[PDB]
Write an enzyme that holds these catalytic residues in place. Structure first.
Site, PDB file in Angstrom:
ATOM      1  N   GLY A 104     -74.761 -16.704  11.822  1.00  0.00           N
ATOM      2  CA  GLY A 104     -73.772 -17.380  11.013  1.00  0.00           C
ATOM      3  C   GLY A 104     -73.864 -18.874  11.225  1.00  0.00           C
ATOM      4  O   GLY A 104     -74.309 -19.352  12.275  1.00  0.00           O
ATOM      5  N   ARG A 105     -73.427 -19.607  10.200  1.00  0.00           N
ATOM      6  CA  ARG A 105     -73.480 -21.056  10.187  1.00  0.00           C
ATOM      7  C   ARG A 105     -72.135 -21.556   9.658  1.00  0.00           C
ATOM      8  O   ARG A 105     -72.013 -22.012   8.525  1.00  0.00           O
ATOM      9  CB  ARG A 105     -74.651 -21.560   9.340  1.00  0.00           C
ATOM     10  CG  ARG A 105     -75.189 -22.923   9.739  1.00  0.00           C
ATOM     11  CD  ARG A 105     -76.583 -23.135   9.164  1.00  0.00           C
ATOM     12  NE  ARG A 105     -77.236 -24.331   9.686  1.00  0.00           N
ATOM     13  CZ  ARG A 105     -77.930 -24.381  10.817  1.00  0.00           C
ATOM     14  NH1 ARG A 105     -78.045 -23.324  11.605  1.00  0.00           N
ATOM     15  NH2 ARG A 105     -78.526 -25.519  11.164  1.00  0.00           N
ATOM     16  N   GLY A 106     -71.104 -21.454  10.494  1.00  0.00           N
ATOM     17  CA  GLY A 106     -69.775 -21.900  10.119  1.00  0.00           C
ATOM     18  C   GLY A 106     -69.632 -23.409  10.116  1.00  0.00           C
ATOM     19  O   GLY A 106     -70.635 -24.131  10.093  1.00  0.00           O
TER      20      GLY A 106
ATOM     21  N   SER B  88     -70.664 -25.665  13.742  1.00  0.00           N
ATOM     22  CA  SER B  88     -71.215 -24.760  14.743  1.00  0.00           C
ATOM     23  C   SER B  88     -72.244 -23.852  14.089  1.00  0.00           C
ATOM     24  O   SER B  88     -72.153 -23.546  12.897  1.00  0.00           O
ATOM     25  CB  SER B  88     -70.123 -23.917  15.419  1.00  0.00           C
ATOM     26  OG  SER B  88     -69.541 -22.986  14.519  1.00  0.00           O
ATOM     27  N   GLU B  89     -73.231 -23.437  14.882  1.00  0.00           N
ATOM     28  CA  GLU B  89     -74.201 -22.443  14.424  1.00  0.00           C
ATOM     29  C   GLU B  89     -74.226 -21.293  15.420  1.00  0.00           C
ATOM     30  O   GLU B  89     -74.157 -21.528  16.624  1.00  0.00           O
ATOM     31  CB  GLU B  89     -75.603 -23.045  14.282  1.00  0.00           C
ATOM     32  CG  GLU B  89     -75.627 -24.492  13.816  1.00  0.00           C
ATOM     33  CD  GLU B  89     -76.996 -25.138  13.977  1.00  0.00           C
ATOM     34  OE1 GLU B  89     -77.995 -24.399  14.108  1.00  0.00           O
ATOM     35  OE2 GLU B  89     -77.074 -26.385  13.976  1.00  0.00           O
ATOM     36  N   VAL B  90     -74.315 -20.052  14.938  1.00  0.00           N
ATOM     37  CA  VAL B  90     -74.192 -18.878  15.804  1.00  0.00           C
ATOM     38  C   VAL B  90     -75.456 -18.025  15.704  1.00  0.00           C
ATOM     39  O   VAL B  90     -75.876 -17.646  14.603  1.00  0.00           O
ATOM     40  CB  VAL B  90     -72.939 -18.048  15.466  1.00  0.00           C
ATOM     41  CG1 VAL B  90     -72.837 -16.841  16.396  1.00  0.00           C
ATOM     42  CG2 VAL B  90     -71.687 -18.907  15.583  1.00  0.00           C
TER      43      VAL B  90
ATOM     44  N   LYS C  92     -73.543 -20.037  20.577  1.00  0.00           N
ATOM     45  CA  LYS C  92     -72.908 -20.888  19.574  1.00  0.00           C
ATOM     46  C   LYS C  92     -73.226 -22.335  19.918  1.00  0.00           C
ATOM     47  O   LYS C  92     -72.799 -22.829  20.966  1.00  0.00           O
ATOM     48  CB  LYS C  92     -71.393 -20.677  19.513  1.00  0.00           C
ATOM     49  CG  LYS C  92     -70.730 -21.579  18.447  1.00  0.00           C
ATOM     50  CD  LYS C  92     -69.277 -21.198  18.116  1.00  0.00           C
ATOM     51  CE  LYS C  92     -68.314 -21.553  19.241  1.00  0.00           C
ATOM     52  NZ  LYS C  92     -66.877 -21.361  18.840  1.00  0.00           N
TER      53      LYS C  92
ATOM     54  N   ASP D 125     -55.787 -20.517  15.003  1.00  0.00           N
ATOM     55  CA  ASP D 125     -56.763 -20.199  13.965  1.00  0.00           C
ATOM     56  C   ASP D 125     -56.934 -18.685  13.867  1.00  0.00           C
ATOM     57  O   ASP D 125     -58.041 -18.177  13.654  1.00  0.00           O
ATOM     58  CB  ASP D 125     -58.100 -20.909  14.235  1.00  0.00           C
ATOM     59  CG  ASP D 125     -59.037 -20.919  13.026  1.00  0.00           C
ATOM     60  OD1 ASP D 125     -58.572 -20.766  11.878  1.00  0.00           O
ATOM     61  OD2 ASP D 125     -60.261 -21.091  13.230  1.00  0.00           O
TER      62      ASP D 125
HETATM   63  O1  LIG Z   1     -63.194  -9.388  11.087  1.00  0.00           O
HETATM   64  C1  LIG Z   1     -64.377  -9.445  11.120  1.00  0.00           C
HETATM   65  C2  LIG Z   1     -65.109 -10.541  10.332  1.00  0.00           C
HETATM   66  C3  LIG Z   1     -66.597 -10.657  10.695  1.00  0.00           C
HETATM   67  C4  LIG Z   1     -67.126 -12.105  10.683  1.00  0.00           C
HETATM   68  C5  LIG Z   1     -68.619 -12.193  11.057  1.00  0.00           C
HETATM   69  C6  LIG Z   1     -68.988 -13.473  11.833  1.00  0.00           C
HETATM   70  C7  LIG Z   1     -70.408 -13.411  12.436  1.00  0.00           C
HETATM   71  C8  LIG Z   1     -70.588 -14.275  13.705  1.00  0.00           C
HETATM   72  N1  LIG Z   1     -70.901 -13.407  14.841  1.00  0.00           N
HETATM   73  C9  LIG Z   1     -70.299 -13.681  16.147  1.00  0.00           C
HETATM   74  N2  LIG Z   1     -69.598 -14.799  16.318  1.00  0.00           N
HETATM   75  C10 LIG Z   1     -69.014 -15.099  17.499  1.00  0.00           C
HETATM   76  C11 LIG Z   1     -68.283 -16.294  17.635  1.00  0.00           C
HETATM   77  C12 LIG Z   1     -67.699 -16.592  18.857  1.00  0.00           C
HETATM   78  C13 LIG Z   1     -66.882 -17.864  19.015  1.00  0.00           C
HETATM   79  O2  LIG Z   1     -66.957 -18.794  18.171  1.00  0.00           O
HETATM   80  O3  LIG Z   1     -66.093 -17.940  19.994  1.00  0.00           O
HETATM   81  C14 LIG Z   1     -67.822 -15.715  19.941  1.00  0.00           C
HETATM   82  C15 LIG Z   1     -68.537 -14.530  19.799  1.00  0.00           C
HETATM   83  C16 LIG Z   1     -69.144 -14.230  18.563  1.00  0.00           C
HETATM   84  C17 LIG Z   1     -69.891 -13.012  18.404  1.00  0.00           C
HETATM   85  C18 LIG Z   1     -70.040 -12.103  19.470  1.00  0.00           C
HETATM   86  N3  LIG Z   1     -70.742 -10.991  19.289  1.00  0.00           N
HETATM   87  C19 LIG Z   1     -71.307 -10.698  18.125  1.00  0.00           C
HETATM   88  C20 LIG Z   1     -71.198 -11.551  17.033  1.00  0.00           C
HETATM   89  C21 LIG Z   1     -70.471 -12.744  17.181  1.00  0.00           C
HETATM   90  N4  LIG Z   1     -65.112  -8.469  11.912  1.00  0.00           N
HETATM   91  O4  LIG Z   1     -64.419  -7.470  12.626  1.00  0.00           O
END
Ligand SMILES: O=C(CCCCCCCNc1nc2cc(C(=O)O)ccc2c2cnccc12)NO
Ligand SMILES: [Cl-]
Ligand SMILES: [Cl-]
Length: 330
Positions: free
Chosen positions: A45-47, A50-52, A67, A155
């Site tokens: 993901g690319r919010g 930040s980039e993930v 991230k 948030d």
């Molecule tokens: O409602 C939902 C909505 C699903 C949204 C998908 C977003 C994809 C990004 N993917 C992850 N973003 C993270 C961000 C943070 C942070 O910014 O703190 C911490 C951990 C993660 C993370 C951990 N493990 C797997 C994936 C991610 N789904 O249930």
């Protein structure tokens, strides 16, 4: 004169009682880990700012998430770091495993525990009544914990709740907008996404507190039990309050504005006009009725109040009958 002051009803002085190093994030010294321990596997993901990535820790072959932080306001780096470290190990809080410097630009990168996520636009269609209650309770656990630790998330929204539905496991993520609560401090109202902004944000009342997160939670609950996403579908920041007023009514809004001596824009005040409160029953129909119950509507009603001091605390919410059977589940 100005706006009337306000104080958190619960957990008011938690940070005052701690040593200053707990909340003085600007004085935090970051302990940097070994960037070579991690290798990026693929982009997730690319919010904003930040980039993930999915990554691998090669010292134990553990899948993790990286991230890369690129905020404009650099002070938010230490803030997010300090808050993640203070909450580490708390119920349903995402675990910060490491902090490293991205070898490309020397920018900070947070390493997190990997969660087996299922997207909400695919998930909230298949949730049963019991599932909605169970996951709301898990979110409440995270929110009571971070509030008890002096922190407001600011948030809360579907994308910031990661759910492994196969294991009924939930994590509250993205603490980049979180702040420490200090009584009397004025906070920025630009936080949160429009559909989840509490009325205090929408009228520019800056002395808000943990109860902001309880409005957001209410907005999520309403969208789940009524299957209307988002529930308050504002098209700009003024329209968001208009949509809220069309449901909760303008009488309680104007009483809220009077209580705290809030300065409303006169043309905006004219635009809000006069709207009666709509009974929650108006939003029930044949397609969502299996998710509605009297205790659901009573709970919702006690989260979605204009006056932030009147909303349920996370702990009061956890004691609401809507969760009675869920509480016996663990
Ligand atoms: O409602 C939902 C909505 C699903 C949204 C998908 C977003 C994809 C990004 N993917 C992850 N973003 C993270 C961000 C943070 C942070 O910014 O703190 C911490 C951990 C993660 C993370 C951990 N493990 C797997 C994936 C991610 N789904 O249930
Ligand atoms: Cl009505
Ligand atoms: Cl609370």
């Amino acid at each position: 004169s100005g706006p009337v002051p306000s104080r958190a009803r619960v957990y008011t002085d938690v940070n005052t009682h701690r040593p200053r190093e707990y909340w003085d994030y600007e004085s935090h010294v970051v302990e940097w880990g070994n960037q070579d321990d991690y290798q990026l596997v693929r982009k997730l993901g690319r919010g904003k700012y930040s980039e993930v990535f999915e990554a691998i820790n090669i010292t134990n072959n553990e899948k993790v998430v990286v991230k890369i932080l690129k905020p404009v306001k650099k002070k938010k780096i230490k803030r997010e770091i300090k808050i993640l470290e203070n909450l580490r190990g708390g119920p349903n809080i995402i675990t910060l495993a490491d902090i490293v410097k991205d070898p490309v630009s020397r920018t900070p990168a947070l390493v997190f525990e990997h969660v087996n996520n299922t997207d909400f636009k695919q998930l909230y269609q298949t949730l049963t009544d019991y599932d909605i209650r169970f996951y709301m309770y898990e979110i409440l656990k995270a929110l009571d914990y971070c509030h008890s630790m002096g922190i407001m998330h600011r948030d809360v929204k579907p994308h910031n709740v990661m759910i492994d539905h196969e294991h009924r496991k939930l994590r509250l993520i993205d603490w980049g907008l979180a702040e420490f609560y200090h009584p009397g401090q004025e906070y920025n109202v630009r936080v949160a996404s429009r559909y989840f902004k509490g009325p205090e944000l929408l009228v520019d009342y800056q002395m808000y507190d943990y109860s902001l997160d309880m409005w957001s939670l209410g907005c999520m609950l309403a969208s789940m039990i009524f299957r209307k996403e988002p529930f308050f579908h504002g098209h700009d920041n003024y329209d968001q309050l208009v949509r809220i007023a069309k449901v909760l009514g303008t009488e309680d809004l104007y009483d809220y504005i009077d209580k705290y001596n809030i300065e409303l824009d006169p043309r905006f005040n004219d635009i809000l006009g006069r709207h009666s409160r709509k009974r929650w029953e108006r939003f029930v129909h044949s397609e969502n009725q299996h998710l509605v119950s009297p205790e659901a509507l009573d709970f919702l009603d006690k989260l979605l109040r204009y006056d932030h001091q009147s909303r349920l605390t996370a702990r009061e919410a956890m004691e609401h009958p809507y969760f009675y059977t869920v509480v016996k589940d663990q």
